[PDB]
Design a binder for this molecule. Structure first.
Ligand SMILES: CCCCCCCCCCCCCCCCCC(=O)O[C@@H](COC(=O)CCCCCCCCCCCCCCC)COP(=O)(O)OCCN
Ligand SMILES: NC(=O)C1=CN([C@@H]2O[C@H](COP(=O)(O)OP(=O)(O)OC[C@H]3O[C@@H](n4cnc5c(N)ncnc54)[C@H](OP(=O)(O)O)[C@@H]3O)[C@@H](O)[C@H]2O)C=CC1
Ligand code: SF4
Ligand code: SF4
Ligand code: SF4
Ligand code: SF4
Ligand code: SF4
Ligand SMILES: [Zn+2]
Lengths: 122, 121, 177, 382, 328, 101, 150, 71, 103, 153, 178, 24
C-alpha cells in the first residue's frame, strides 16, 4: 500500500474479496472478483510498478483476458504464444528519450537514416 | 364539432363545408381561363367537380371526409386554396400548348428494384 | 386562438379537489421531489465507473485497434505483397513497395501504414488474403510525436509478433465468421 | 445588435457558430455558419469504390452511426438489385434501431445538458456505453462500425449477442423511465421547453424537416411507415406524433421513439431467421475467408471486390431511410464504373439547422441552445 | 543543395540545419524560413521540452527535429551535429546568468560549436550570429564576447558566414516588448542616455531571410561578415515614437543620464554573488545593454549590407511592428 | 414513491452479463454463406442481379405524340388520381400488447 | 451463350491455383476480369487441382505454369511473330505444360511481349518481378528511343 | 539478406528469409501438396497446390515452406 | 440577381455599378482592416480598376455577370470581418528560371 | 542539495498532472467518444480532468474530429489564449494526422499544422479508454517536465 | 403517372424517367415554374424540397445538373425534377416556394458554381471564407489548389499557401469487359 | 419588447401514436 496519492487505492480497495488469477512475467498481478457485483469491474490488473505504471504494460497473453475479449488467462495462452518469432512486450516507450521511442527510417534520429531517392546517383 | 386537426397550424374550421363550396365554385369559375385541351384543365375540372359535388350532397364535415376520402376538410381547404393560387398563377406565364419541336425524351428505364430498399408504400 | 386554447386548457382542470391537487403539486414542488428522490437512489447505488489503468472496458475479438502484420508460425512474414489492403484502404494509409527477395518468394520491401491517415475500419484485415495484416486489440499507442505514429515499413507492424498470442486467439475465435 | 454565439459547451455541439442578430435578449434572427465541419465527404466519395465509400457514412452522423450505412447500403442495393437475406434485414434493423436508441439517448440528454440537467447526460451515456458493447462486439469499432455493407451486412452476430441485447432490452424501459421521470415532470423542464421552437406543420414541411421535427408538428410521416425499407413492414411499432410542435413535444417523441425502438429491438431479437448473412451474389458480397481461400472462383471475387468493387450499373436513385436525426437520404448518381458519381448526401441538420432562423425568432438568447438541442444538430451531416 | 521539390513544406533543400538558437526570438523566424523552404532543421533545445514545441509545426513531419543537448558538454553537440550540413549559431545572451557567464554563453560556446563542427567535416556552411557593432573594445561585455566569438569562429573555421544583425524588432522581441509593458507604467518610457543613440533596427523576418539567403547563395557569403542593419537609421527616442503610434498611448518620455541608469542597473549585476537565487532577467535596465547604448556604433559601415544578398529589408512602420497592436 | 413499481427492479448493474466472453469459442458458429440449393448449382445468369435487367428504353416524344395523348385523355375520372396517404393521429397510452413487447 | 461462358470459366478456374494475390498480373488479368464479369460467382470444384513446376525461361519471363491455362497463345506467338520456335505445348490432357522441353532460355528478342500476349499471370516480366500492381501504375503514352523504329 | 536489409534495421532478430530457409522441407506422398497454411485451412493462405516432379524442393510461394516428393 | 445581360451593354452597366460600389465602399475597407496608412485611396482604386480591366476582354455577357458576382462576394467578405487583413495588404529571363528548376 | 529541487519539481508536476482541465475542442464524433471518456464509465473527473468550456483557464486542449480549413483559424485563436503551461492532445485520426480526409481540400492534414501537439490519441474512433490512455500519457509528459531544475539551469 | 398528364407538356421539356424514382428533367427556364406546379396543386402536393443535388457531367455541354428532389408528404411519393445549367448560367431559385432551398442552393453554388436567380443571400456556405474554386466539380482536384493552412511568423494567423502533400494515389481498378 | 413570450401553458400530455396501432 502506502500510496494515498493514487487511484491505486481504488484497486487495493478491490482485491478484498477478489481471487488472484495468475501473474505474468513483468509482475502484474491479474485479479478476478466475479459473482459479487458490478460487471465490467470483475477483472483488473495490479501493475507491480506502483509508481510509473501505465496501460499497455499488460502483455498480449493477458490483454485478452483483461479486456473481457476472451476467458483464457495468460497462463493458458502462454502455451499458444509462438516460440520461433515470439517477442516480449515493450511498455510503449512513447517520449521516454530517443532510442526507446520508435523512429521511421528517415527521421535523422534513427541510426541508419535511409535515403529514398529511387535513382542511384553516379 | 371537430376538436382539432392533429396537424399543428391547420386550425380547425367550423364552417368547413361552406368555405369548401365557395372555394370549389371559385375554382370551377377560374379554371375556364385555361385552354380546354390541356390535361391540367381536365384534371382540375374533374376533381373539383367531384369534391364540390360530395360537399354539396353531404352536410357534416365528417361525412365529407368519409365519402370524399382525402384526409381532413381543413387539409382539403388547404388543397383547394392552393389550387386557386395555381390557377391564378398558371393564367400568368401561360405554359399551355405544345411548341413546334417539343423534343421530349422518355428515358423510361425499368430496373428491377430489390424492395428491401425504401421505394415507398 | 391561443387565448381560447388557454381558456379551455384551464377550464379542463376546474373542479375543486382537482384544482387542489394541482395546487399542492405546484406549490409543494412534488414533480421535483420525484426528481430528487431518483437522484438520491442513484447517489447511493453502486457506481458504473472503471478505474482505468488497472481495469479496462470490455472489448471483442473483432475489436479494431493497432494494426499488426502477422507472421506464419515458422517465421516468414505472412505479407505476400498483393497490395489488396493498399487498394482497399479508404484513407490510403498503407504504402506497399514489393521486391522478389533473394529466396525468390515475393515480399514487401516497404509496408508502411500511416496510423494518423488511417480510419481503423478493418478493411485491410478483410482484404488481406492470408490474414497478413490484422488489427491487434492494442488501441493503447498514443505517441508523443506524429512521426512515431506513422508505422514504419514492416518493422513496427512486425511488433505484432508480441501481440500474436492475442491476435492468434482472436483470429481462431473470429474465423468462424 | 450582432452576437457571435459559438459553441456554448464544446464536445457536445462541436462547431456551432451561429451569428445571432439580437434585440436585447430577444433574438431577431439566427444566422448559422456552416463549413467548420465541412470535410470533403461529397467529393472524397467520388474518388473511392462503393466499399471504400461506406466508412464515410458512419462518419456523416457521429451520434447515430449505422443508420447512415443503412441508408447508403439501401442506395447501392436500389441500383444493384441486390436482394439481401432475411437475417441481414433483421440484423440491419436491430442495429438501425439500436442506433435510433443510441442517438436519442445522446440527442435527448446532450440537449438536457445544454438546458442544464447534468445527470441525464451521464445516465444516458452509461446506456450508450452498453449499446457500444454491441456495436464494438458485432463489428469492432465502438462508434464507426463499418458493418452494414451494401450486400447484406459485414459479418454475422457473435454467438452471444442476442442474449446480451435481450438482457439489455429488459432493463432499458427503466432507463427511459428515469430519463423521463427526471425531465418530463419537472416544471423547470417544461418551462424551458414548452412553447419553445414551435413549428407549425406548414413550416416543418416547407423547410424540409422530415424527422422528429416533422412529427412534432403532427404530420404523421415516418419513412418506416411510409416507405418500409426492411422488415419494418413486418415489425409492429407506433410512431409517436406530436400535437403542438414545441420543443417539449419533440422531447416527448424522442423519449417515446426510444421506447418504440425498444419494441423493434425486442421483435428483431425474437424473430431473427437463421439464414445467410450476406447476399448470395458473390459478385456484390465478398466471399467469406474460409471460401475464398478454398475456392479459386471465390478468391477471384474477393480480389475484384476488395480492389475493383461492384461497378453498380448506371442509374441515379434517392434512397432515404428514417435516420434518428430525420430523413437521411443519399442521392447516389452512379456512373457505370466501380466508383460512385456525385454521391450526394441529403442529411437532416442541413435542413433542420435552416429552421433555426425561424424557430428561434423572438425566443430568448438562452433558448437558442434549446432549439439547437431539439434539432439534434450534428455538424458532421452539415 | 540536393533540392528535390517545388516550394517548401514538403520539398527538400539538402539543408539539414542545426539552428543552435532556434528556441529563441530570432530562432523561430529562421527555423520557419529553413523549414518552409523545405529543409530539415535539427533544432537543439537546452532545457524544458516545451521550449521548441512551437517549432514542431512549421516543418513537415521530421523537417524539424527538436533535440536535447547540454551547452557545456560536447559529445552531445557532436550528436546534434551528427547528420547536418548547415549549422547556424543563434546561442547568445544579453544578460549574465549565475550559471553561464557572458563569455560562456556568447564566445566560449560559438568557439566550441565552431570546433566541434570543424571536427565533423561536412558542415558546408556555418553561419555565426552576433550583434552589429560587436567589435572588441565595445563597452558592453556582451559585444566584446560576441566579437571574440566572431574572431574564434572564423579562425577555428574559415569560410563561415557571420551575420551582424543590429537590435532586431518583431513579436516576442527584447527591444520593443520591454518598452511596452513599461509604458504600462502609465506611459512612462525611460529612454536612456537621452535618445542620442543611433542604432538601425531590422524586422526579424528580414534577418532570418538574410540568414537563409547566405545558405541558398553560392560559394560566396563564406567568411564574409555581413551587417544585417536594416533601413531608416533611427534613434532610441525616434523608435519609441513609432511604438506609441501602434499602441494607443501618449508619448510621455523621460531622459535618464547614463550614471543614473547604471546605478539603477547596479543591482541584477551581482548575478555571480546571489547563488541560491536566480535573478529575473533584466529586461529594460541592463548595465551591459546600457554600455552598448552609450556609443552609437550600432550603424552599418561600408561592410556588407542586405544589398549583397539581393535582399532589401522591410521598414519598421506598419506590419513589421504591428505586433504592438496586442498592447492597445 | 417514485418510478419503482416492482419494474425498475430490472436495474442497470447486471453482474451476470456477457457470461461467455466473446473470443471464447464454446460453440463454433457456422454462419451459412449460400443457400443449400445454390451450392452445387452455380448457374449465375439466372441468379444475376447486377446485369440481369431490362435495358433502358429511351424513346423520344414529338409534338404529334403528346397532342395525340392529350386528345386521348378525355376525362380524369376518379381512380386516375393519386391516392392520398391517409394518416390520422390517435391517442394510446400502453394498449399495444399491454406495455409488454 | 452465357451458360457456355460460365461453364468454360469454371473449367479454367478449376485446375487453376489460387495464386491471384501472389500473381504479378493480379489486377490486369483476363481470367480475373472474365470470371468477375462473365464467369459464375462460385466454383463447385473441391478436389486436388493439378500443379506444374515453374520452367526457367530466362532472365525476362518469370514462369509459373501452374497458373497458365494452356490456351496456347504464347506457343503460337513464339512460333509465328517472334519466329524462334522454342516454346511448346508438351504433353496431353490436364498434364499439358507450356514451355521449352529442355531448359532453354528464350534466346529470341521480341519474346518479352509473351507477357502481354499471356492472358494469365503464368508468363510475367521477371524484371518487373513483383515491384508494383496493375492499379498503382500511372500510365503515360510515351514513345521509345532505344532503337530507331520508334 | 539485402532485400530484408531494406525494411529491417534491427539486424539482431533472425531475418524472416532465414527463419524460413532453416525449416526443413516436408516429406509427402503424392505429386501435389496442399500447404493450406499453418494448420487451419481458414487461418492460412489460399490453398496452393505445389508440384513435386522436380528433385529439388518446391517452395510454397505464399508461406515459404518447402515440399519434397519422398518416393 | 437575374442575368439581365442579354447583351454586353447591360453587363457593362452593372460592371460600372459594381465598380462604383467597391469605390464608394473603400472607406469601410480602409477602416475595418486598417490600410489608411499603408495604402492610398488612389492605390486601392488603381487595384480595383486593374482587376476590372485585367478581365475586360470577355465577349461573353454571362461570364462577366459571374465575374461581377465573384467580385461582390469578395467585397462583401472584405467589408465585414469575414476574411482577415494580412491578405488585403497583399491584394492591394529564361536563364533565371533554368537555374531554379526544370519546369 | 539538488534533492530539494527534485522534490519541488515532483510537486509542481504532481499538481499539473493531477488537475489538468482541457478545453475540449470536441469537433465531430471523437467529441462523442471524448463525451464517453467524460461519461460515467471512464471518468475523466476522476483523474482531475474537468472539461472546461472556455479557452481562458485550461491546461490542455483535446482537439478531436476533422480540423476543417475554416475551423483552423478558430482553433489557433483558441490555442493562443491558453495559459502558458498548456498542452494539446490530438484525438482521432482526423485531428492527429490527415486521417480519412487527408486528401480533402477543406481538411488540414492534422492539427499539427495549427497547434503544436504533445500527445496524439491514436485510432480514428479511439476507444474511450484509448483517449483516456492518451491523457495518462499527457500525465507522463507532465511528470517529465522538471521546470524548476531548468529555471535553475 | 398522373403528374405527367396534367403537367404542361412544355414544362417537362427534355427527359422523363420511370424507375429508381421518377424524374422530370426539365429546362432551367421552366424550372421554378415547374416547381410551382407539383406544389400548391390538389392532386400533386409535394410541399417538401428534400434535396438539391448538383451533379457535374464534364463531358456534357450543359455541365451541371441541378437535381431537385421533392417529397410529397400527402400522396406519399417522391419526384426528382432536374435541370441543366453550365458554369455561367444563372438558374431560377426555388427558395420562394420551398424555403429550405436557401441553404441547398447556397451549397450548390458553393460546390459547383450554379448561381441562383433572385436567391436572397447567395453566399458560399460550406467552403472556406476566402475559398476560390468550386470543389464538387470534376476538374477540381481532390486535394484542392491552395488549401494547406499552417501557422507561421504571421502569428495568430494560418496562411493559405499553395498545397503540397503525400500524392493522392489514384488506383485504376476499373477493369475491361466492364 | 412586444416579442411573443413563451407561454408555458398547453394541453395535457396524451401520447399520440399513429392510426396504425392494430390494423394499419
Ligand atoms: C428544496 C430543494 C430544492 C427544490 C427544487 C427547487 C426548484 C426551484 C423553483 C421552484 C418553483 O418556484 O417552482 C414553481 C413554484 O414553486 C414554488 O412555489 C415553491 C414555479 O411556478 P410554477 O411553474 O409551478 O407555476 C406557474 C407556472 N406558470
Ligand atoms: N534580441 C536582439 O535584439 C538581438 C539579438 N541578436 C543575437 O541574435 C541571436 C538570437 O537572438 P534571440 O533569439 O533573441 O536571443 P535569446 O536571448 O532569446 O536566445 C536565443 C537562443 O539562445 C539560446 N541560448 C542563449 N544563451 C544560451 C546558453 N548559455 N546556453 C544555451 N543556449 C543558450 C537560447 O536557449 P534558451 O531559450 O533555452 O535559453 C535560445 O535558444 C543571439 O546571438 C543574439 O545576441 C542580435 C541582435 C540583437
Ligand atoms: S483500417 Fe486498414 S484499410 Fe482501413 S484505413 Fe486503416 S489501414 Fe487502411
Ligand atoms: S497485408 Fe494482406 S493485402 Fe496487404 S500486401 Fe500483405 S497479404 Fe496483401
Ligand atoms: S492469372 Fe493470376 S491473377 Fe489471374 S486468375 Fe490466375 S492466378 Fe489470379
Ligand atoms: S499464353 Fe500464358 S496462359 Fe496461354 S498457354 Fe501460354 S503460358 Fe499458358
Ligand atoms: S478521426 Fe475518425 S473518429 Fe475521429 S473525428 Fe475523424 S472520422 Fe471521426
Ligand atoms: Zn504455404
Amino acid at each position: 500500500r502506502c500510496l494515498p496519492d493514487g487511484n491505486l487505492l481504488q484497486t487495493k480497495i478491490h482485491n478484498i474479496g477478489a481471487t488472484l488469477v495468475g501473474v505474468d512475467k513483468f509482475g502484474n498481478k491479474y485479479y478476478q472478483k466475479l459473482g459479487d457485483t458490478q460487471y465490467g469491474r470483475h477483472r483488473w490488473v495490479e501493475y507491480a510498478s506502483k509508481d510509473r505504471y501505465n496501460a499497455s504494460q499488460v502483455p498480449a497473453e493477458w490483454h485478452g483476458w483483461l479486456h473481457f475479449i476472451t476467458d483464457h488467462t495468460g497462463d493458458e495462452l502462454l502455451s499458444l504464444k509462438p516460440k520461433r518469432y515470439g517477442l516480449e512486450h515493450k511498455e510503449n516507450f512513447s517520449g521516454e528519450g530517443d532510442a526507446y521511442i520508435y523512429h521511421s527510417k528517415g527521421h535523422t534520429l534513427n541510426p541508419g537514416q535511409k535515403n529514398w531517392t529511387r535513382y542511384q546517383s553516379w | 364539432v371537430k376538436q382539432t386537426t392533429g396537424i399543428v397550424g391547420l386550425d380547425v374550421v367550423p364552417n368547413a363545408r361552406a368555405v369548401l363550396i365557395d372555394l370549389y365554385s371559385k375554382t370551377l369559375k377560374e379554371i375556364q381561363a385555361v385552354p380546354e385541351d390541356e390535361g391540367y384543365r381536365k384534371a382540375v375540372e374533374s376533381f373539383t367537380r367531384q369534391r364540390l359535388n360530395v360537399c354539396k350532397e353531404e352536410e357534416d364535415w365528417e361525412m365529407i371526409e368519409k365519402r370524399l376520402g382525402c384526409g381532413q376538410v381543413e387539409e382539403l381547404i388547404e388543397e383547394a386554396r392552393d389550387e386557386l393560387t395555381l390557377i391564378g398563377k398558371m393564367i400568368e406565364w401561360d405554359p399551355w400548348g405544345v411548341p413546334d419541336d417539343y423534343e421530349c425524351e422518355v428515358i423510361e428505364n425499368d430496373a428491377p428494384i430489390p424492395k428491401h430498399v425504401p421505394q415507398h408504400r | 386562438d391561443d387565448e381560447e386554447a388557454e381558456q379551455l386548457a384551464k377550464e379542463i382542470s376546474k373542479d375543486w379537489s382537482t384544482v387542489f391537487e394541482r395546487s399542492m403539486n405546484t406549490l409543494f414542488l412534488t414533480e421535483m421531489v420525484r426528481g430528487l428522490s431518483l437522484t438520491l437512489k442513484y447517489f447511493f447505488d453502486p457506481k458504473v465507473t472503471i478505474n482505468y489503468p488497472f481495469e479496462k472496458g470490455p472489448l471483442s475479438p473483432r475489436f479494431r485497434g493497432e494494426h499488426a502484420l502477422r507472421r506464419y508460425p515458422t517465421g516468414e512474414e505472412r505479407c505476400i505483397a498483393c497490395k489488396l489492403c493498399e487498394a482497399v484502404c479508404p484513407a490510403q494509409a498503407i504504402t506497399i513497395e514489393a521486391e522478389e527477395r533473394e529466396d525468390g518468394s515475393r515480399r514487401t520491401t516497404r509496408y508502411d501504414i500511416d496510423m494518423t491517415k488511417c480510419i481503423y475500419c478493418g478493411f485491410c484485415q478483410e482484404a488481406c488474403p492470408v490474414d497478413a495484416i490484422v488489427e491487434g486489440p492494442n488501441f493503447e499507442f498514443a505517441t508523443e510525436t506524429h512521426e512515431e505514429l506513422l508505422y514504419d515499413k514492416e518493422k513496427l507492424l512486425e511488433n505484432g509478433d508480441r501481440w500474436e498470442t492475442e491476435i492468434a486467439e482472436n483470429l481462431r475465435s473470429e474465423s468462424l465468421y | 445588435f450582432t452576437l457571435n454565439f459559438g459553441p456554448q459547451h464544446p464536445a457536445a455541439h462541436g462547431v456551432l457558430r451561429l451569428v445571432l442578430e439580437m434585440n436585447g435578449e430577444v433574438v431577431e434572427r439566427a444566422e448559422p455558419h456552416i463549413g467548420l465541419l465541412h470535410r470533403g465527404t461529397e467529393k472524397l466519395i467520388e474518388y473511392k469504390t462503393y466499399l471504400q465509400a461506406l466508412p464515410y457514412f458512419d462518419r456523416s452522423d457521429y451520434v447515430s452511426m449505422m443508420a447512415q450505412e443503412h441508408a447508403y447500403s439501401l442506395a447501392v442495393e436500389k441500383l444493384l438489385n441486390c436482394e439481401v437475406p432475411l437475417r441481414a434485414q433483421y440484423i440491419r434493423v436491430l442495429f438501425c434501431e439500436i442506433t435510433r436508441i443510441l442517438n436519442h439517448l445522446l440527442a435527448l440528454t446532450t440537449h438536457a445538458m445544454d438546458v442544464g440537467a447534468l445527470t441525464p447526460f451521464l445516465w444516458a451515456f452509461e446506456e450508450r456505453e452498453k449499446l457500444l458493447e454491441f456495436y464494438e462486439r458485432v463489428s469492432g469499432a465502438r462508434m464507426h462500425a463499418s458493418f452494414i455493407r451494401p450486400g447484406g451486412v459485414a459479418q454475422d452476430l457473435p454467438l452471444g449477442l442476442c442474449r446480451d441485447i435481450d438482457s439489455f432490452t429488459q432493463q432499458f424501459a427503466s432507463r427511459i423511465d428515469e430519463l423521463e421521470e427526471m425531465l418530463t415532470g419537472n416544471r423547470i423542464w417544461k418551462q424551458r421547453l414548452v412553447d419553445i421552437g414551435t413549428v407549425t406543420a406548414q413550416q416543418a414541411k416547407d423547410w424540409g424537416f422530415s424527422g422528429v421535427m416533422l412529427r412534432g408538428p403532427g404530420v404523421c410521416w415516418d419513412l418506416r411507415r411510409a416507405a418500409p425499407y426492411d422488415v419494418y413492414d413486418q415489425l409492429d411499432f407506433d410512431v409517436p406524433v406530436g400535437t403542438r410542435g414545441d420543443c417539449y413535444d419533440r422531447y416527448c417523441i424522442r423519449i417515446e421513439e426510444m421506447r418504440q425502438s425498444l419494441r423493434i429491438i425486442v421483435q428483431c431479437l425474437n424473430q431473427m431467421p437463421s439464414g445467410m448473412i450476406k447476399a448470395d451474389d458473390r459478385k456484390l458480397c465478398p466471399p467469406s475467408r474460409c471460401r475464398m481461400k478454398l475456392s479459386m472462383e471465390s478468391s477471384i471475387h474477393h480480389f475484384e471486390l476488395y480492389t475493383e468493387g461492384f461497378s453498380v450499373p448506371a442509374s441515379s436513385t434517392y434512397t432515404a431511410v428514417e435516420a434518428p436525426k430525420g430523413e437521411f437520404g443519399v442521392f447516389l448518381v452512379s456512373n457505370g464504373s466501380n466508383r460512385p458519381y456525385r454521391c450526394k448526401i441529403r442529411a437532416p441538420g442541413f435542413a433542420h439547422l435552416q429552421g433555426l432562423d425561424f424557430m428561434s425568432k423572438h425566443h430568448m438568447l438562452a433558448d437558442v441552445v434549446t432549439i439547437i438541442g431539439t434539432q439534434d444538430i450534428v455538424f458532421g451531416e452539415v | 543543395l540536393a533540392r528535390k521539390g517545388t516550394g517548401g513544406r514538403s520539398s527538400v533543400s539538402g539543408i539539414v540545419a542545426t539552428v543552435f538558437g532556434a528556441t529563441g526570438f530570432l530562432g523561430r523566424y529562421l527555423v520557419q524560413q529553413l523549414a518552409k523552404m523545405g529543409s530539415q532543421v535539427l533544432v537543439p533545445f537546452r532545457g524544458s521540452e516545451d521550449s521548441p514545441r512551437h517549432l514542431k509545426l512549421m516543418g513537415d513531419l521530421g523537417q524539424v527535429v527538436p533535440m536535447k543537448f547540454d551547452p557545456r558538454d560536447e559529445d552531445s553537440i557532436k550528436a546534434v551535429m551528427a547528420k547536418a550540413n548547415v549549422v547556424i549559431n543563434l546561442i547568445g545572451r544579453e544578460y549574465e546568468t549565475r550559471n553561464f557567464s557572458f563569455e560562456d554563453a556568447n564566445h566560449h560556446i560559438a568557439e566550441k560549436l565552431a570546433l566541434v563542427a570543424k571536427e565533423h567535416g561536412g558542415i558546408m556552411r556555418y553561419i555565426q550570429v552576433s550583434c552589429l557593432g560587436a567589435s572588441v573594445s565595445s563597452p558592453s561585455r556582451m559585444l566584446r564576447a560576441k566579437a571574440a566569438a566572431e574572431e574564434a569562429v572564423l579562425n577555428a573555421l574559415p569560410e563561415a558566414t557571420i551575420m551582424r544583425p543590429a537590435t532586431m524588432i518583431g513579436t516576442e522581441d527584447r527591444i520593443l516588448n520591454p518598452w511596452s509593458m513599461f509604458v504600462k507604467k502609465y506611459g512612462f518610457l525611460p529612454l536612456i542616455g537621452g535618445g542620442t543613440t543611433k542604432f538601425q533596427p531590422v524586422y526579424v523576418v528580414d534577418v532570418a531571410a538574410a540568414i537563409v539567403a547566405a545558405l541558398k547563395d553560392d560559394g560566396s557569403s563564406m567568411g564574409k561578415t555581413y551587417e544585417l542593419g536594416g533601413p531608416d537609421v533611427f534613434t532610441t527616442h525616434e523608435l519609441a515614437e513609432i511604438m506609441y503610434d501602434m499602441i494607443r498611448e501618449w508619448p510621455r518620455y523621460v531622459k535618464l543620464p547614463f550614471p543614473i541608469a547604471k546605478a539603477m542597473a547596479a543591482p541584477r549585476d551581482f548575478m555571480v554573488n546571489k547563488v541560491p537565487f536566480p535573478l529575473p532577467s533584466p529586461q529594460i535596465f541592463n548595465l551591459d545593454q546600457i554600455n552598448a547604448l552609450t556609443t552609437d556604433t550600432l550603424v552599418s559601415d561600408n561592410a556588407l549590407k542586405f544589398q549583397d544578398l539581393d535582399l532589401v529589408p522591410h521598414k519598421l512602420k506598419g506590419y513589421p511592428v504591428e505586433f504592438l497592436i496586442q498592447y492597445r | 414513491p417514485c418510478a419503482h413499481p416492482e419494474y425498475l427492479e430490472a436495474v442497470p448493474k447486471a453482474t451476470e452479463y456477457r457470461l461467455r466472453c466473446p473470443a471464447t469459442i464454446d460453440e463454433e458458429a457456422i454462419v451459412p454463406s449460400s443457400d443449400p440449393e445454390t451450392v452445387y448449382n452455380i448457374v449465375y445468369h439466372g441468379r444475376d442481379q447486377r446485369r440481369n435487367r431490362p435495358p433502358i428504353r429511351r424513346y423520344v416524344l414529338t409534338k404529334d405524340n403528346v397532342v395525340q395523348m392529350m386528345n386521348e385523355k378525355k376525362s380524369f375520372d376518379v381512380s386516375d388520381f393519386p391516392k392520398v396517404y391517409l394518416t390520422t393521429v390517435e391517442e394510446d397510452l400502453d394498449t399495444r400488447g399491454g406495455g409488454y413487447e | 451463350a452465357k451458360k457456355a461462358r460460365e461453364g468454360v470459366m469454371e473449367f479454367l478456374l478449376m485446375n487453376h491455383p489460387l495464386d491471384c494475390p501472389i500473381c504479378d498480373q493480379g489486377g490486369e488479368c483476363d481470367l480475373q476480369d472474365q470470371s468477375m464479369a462473365f464467369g459464375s460467382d462460385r466454383g463447385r470444384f473441391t478436389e486436388m487441382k493439378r500443379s506444374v513446376v515453374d520452367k526457367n525461361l530466362g532472365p525476362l519471363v518469370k514462369t509459373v505454369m501452374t497458373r497458365c491455362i494452356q490456351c496456347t497463345r504464347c506457343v503460337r506467338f513464339a512460333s509465328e511473330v517472334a519466329g524462334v520456335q522454342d516454346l511448346g505445348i508438351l504433353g496431353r490432357g490436364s498434364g499439358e505444360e507450356i514451355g521449352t522441353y529442355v531448359e532453354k532460355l528464350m534466346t529470341s528478342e521480341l519474346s518479352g511481349n509473351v507477357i502481354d500476349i499471356c492472358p494469365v499471370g503464368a508468363l510475367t516480366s521477371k524484371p518487373f518481378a513483383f515491384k508494383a500492381r496493375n492499379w498503382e501504375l500511372k500510365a503515360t503514352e510515351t514513345i521509345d528511343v532505344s532503337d530507331a523504329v520508334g | 539478406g539485402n532485400h530484408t536489409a531494406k525494411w529491417m534495421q534491427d539486424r539482431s532478430k533472425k531475418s524472416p528469409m532465414e527463419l524460413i530457409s532453416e525449416v526443413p522441407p516436408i516429406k509427402v506422398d503424392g505429386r501435389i501438396v496442399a500447404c493450406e497454411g499453418d494448420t487451419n485451412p481458414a487461418l492460412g493462405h489460399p490453398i496452393e497446390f505445389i508440384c513435386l516432379d522436380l528433385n529439388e524442393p518446391a517452395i510454397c510461394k505464399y508461406c515459404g515452406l518447402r515440399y519434397v516428393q519422398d518416393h | 440577381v437575374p442575368p439581365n445581360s442579354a447583351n454586353l451593354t447591360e453587363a457593362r452597366r452593372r460592371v460600372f455599378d459594381f465598380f462604383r460600389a467597391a469605390c464608394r465602399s473603400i472607406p469601410t475597407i480602409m477602416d475595418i482592416y486598417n490600410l489608411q496608412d499603408v495604402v492610398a485611396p488612389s492605390q486601392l482604386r488603381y487595384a480595383i480598376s486593374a482587376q476590372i480591366r485585367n478581365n475586360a476582354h470577355i465577349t461573353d455577357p454571362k461570364v462577366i455577370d459571374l465575374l461581377i458576382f465573384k467580385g461582390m462576394e469578395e467585397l462583401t467578405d472584405i467589408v465585414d470581418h469575414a476574411k482577415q487583413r494580412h491578405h488585403i495588404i497583399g491584394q492591394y529571363d529564361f536563364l533565371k528560371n533554368f537555374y531554379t528548376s526544370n519546369y | 542539495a539538488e534533492f530539494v529541487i527534485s522534490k519541488v519539481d515532483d510537486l509542481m508536476n504532481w499538481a499539473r498532472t493531477g488537475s489538468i482541465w482541457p478545453m475540449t475542442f470536441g469537433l465531430a464524433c471523437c467529441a462523442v467518444e471524448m463525451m464517453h471518456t467524460g461519461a460515467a464509465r471512464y471518468d475523466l473527473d476522476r483523474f482531475g480532468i474537468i472539461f472546461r468550456p472556455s479557452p481562458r483557464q485550461s491546461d490542455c486542449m483535446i482537439v478531436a474530429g476533422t480540423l476543417t480549413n475554416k475551423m483552423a483559424p478558430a482553433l489557433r485563436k483558441v490555442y493562443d489564449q491558453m495559459p502558458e503551461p498548456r498542452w494539446v492532445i490530438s484525438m482521432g485520426s482526423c485531428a492527429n494526422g490527415g486521417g480519412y480526409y487527408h486528401y480533402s481540400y477543406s481538411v488540414v492534414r492534422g492539427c499539427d499544422r495549427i497547434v503544436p501537439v504533445d500527445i496524439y490519441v491514436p485510432g480514428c474512433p479511439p476507444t474511450a479508454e484509448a483517449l483516456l490512455y492518451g491523457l495518462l500519457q499527457l500525465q507522463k509528459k507532465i511528470n517529465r517536465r522538471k521546470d524548476f531544475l531548468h529555471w535553475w539551469n | 403517372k398522373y403528374s405527367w398528364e396534367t403537367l404542361p407538356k412544355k414544362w417537362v421539356k427534355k427527359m422523363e424517367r420511370s424507375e429508381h424514382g421518377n424524374r422530370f428533367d426539365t429546362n432551367t427556364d421552366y424550372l421554378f415554374q415547374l416547381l410551382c406546379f407539383l406544389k400548391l396543386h390538389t392532386y400533386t402536393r409535394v410541399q417538401v424540397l428534400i434535396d438539391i443535388c448538383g451533379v457535374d457531367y464534364p463531358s456534357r455541354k450543359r455541365r451541371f445538373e441541378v437535381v431537385y428532389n421533392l417529397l410529397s408528404t400527402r400522396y406519399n411519393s417522391r419526384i426528382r425534377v432536374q435541370t441543366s445549367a453550365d458554369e455561367v448560367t444563372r438558374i431560377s431559385s426555388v427558395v420562394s416556394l420551398f424555403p429550405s432551398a436557401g441553404w441547398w442552393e447556397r451549397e450548390v453554388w458553393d460546390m459547383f458554381g450554379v448561381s441562383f436567380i433572385n436567391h436572397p443571400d447567395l453566399r458560399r456556405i460550406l467552403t472556406d471564407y476566402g475559398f476560390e474554386g468550386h470543389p464538387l466539380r470534376k476538374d477540381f482536384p481532390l486535394s484542392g489548389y491552395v488549401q494547406v493552412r499552417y501557422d507561421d511568423p504571421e502569428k495568430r494567423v494560418v496562411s493559405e499557401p499553395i498545397e503540397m502533400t503525400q500524392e493522392f494515389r489514384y488506383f485504376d481498378f476499373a477493369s475491361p469487359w466492364e | 419588447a412586444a416579442a411573443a413570450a413563451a407561454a408555458a401553458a398547453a394541453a395535457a400530455a396524451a401520447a399520440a401514436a399513429a392510426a396504425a396501432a392494430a390494423a394499419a
